[PDB]
Amino acid sequence: FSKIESEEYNSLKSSTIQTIGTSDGGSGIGYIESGDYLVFNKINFGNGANSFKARVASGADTPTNIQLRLGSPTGTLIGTLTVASTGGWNNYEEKSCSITNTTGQHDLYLVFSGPVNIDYFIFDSN
Ligand SMILES: [Ca+2]
Ligand code: NA
């Protein structure tokens, strides 16, 4: 549940997504459109996690939400990270939001409401 690179998803649903280069020679996911989602099979939150942090970039004219659901694309919604513009598609920063205390192993789904670039995300226990 610690740190997960979004380019290393197990599956996804989209007709636009592509693996892009992120700042500092890193890799990530871009060309996301409303409705798309990334799937990360069997993530183990262990004893629990109540925080979500993601390194994202956005040069959009409107904010984008990243819903965090478990089990399926419509699964339990444990949190939603709203990503306001960061001034550019290559202006990456870490944004955090809380999530309902989640424990054990689950299949993680990230559902997007629009375009945003995402490098990696982390689950912690604040
Ligand atoms: Ca990455
Ligand atoms: Na995008």
Please characterize this protein's 3D structure.
This protein is globular. The chain is built from no helices and 11 strands. The two termini are 14 Å apart. The protein has 126 residues and is mainly β. Helices cover 0% and strands 62% of the residues. Residues 5-7, 22, 26-28, 119-120 line the site of calcium ion. Calcium ion (CA) binds next to strand 4 and strand 11. It comes from Acetivibrio thermocellus. Belongs to the glycosyl hydrolase 11 (cellulase G) family. This is endo-1,4-beta-xylanase.
Briefly, what is this?
0% of the residues lie in helices and 62% in strands.
Summary keywords:
binds sodium ion, monomer, mainly beta, four-stranded antiparallel sheet, globular, 11 strands, xylanase, Jelly Rolls, carbohydrate binding module, about 130 residues, binds calcium ion, five-stranded antiparallel sheet, endo-1,4-beta-xylanase
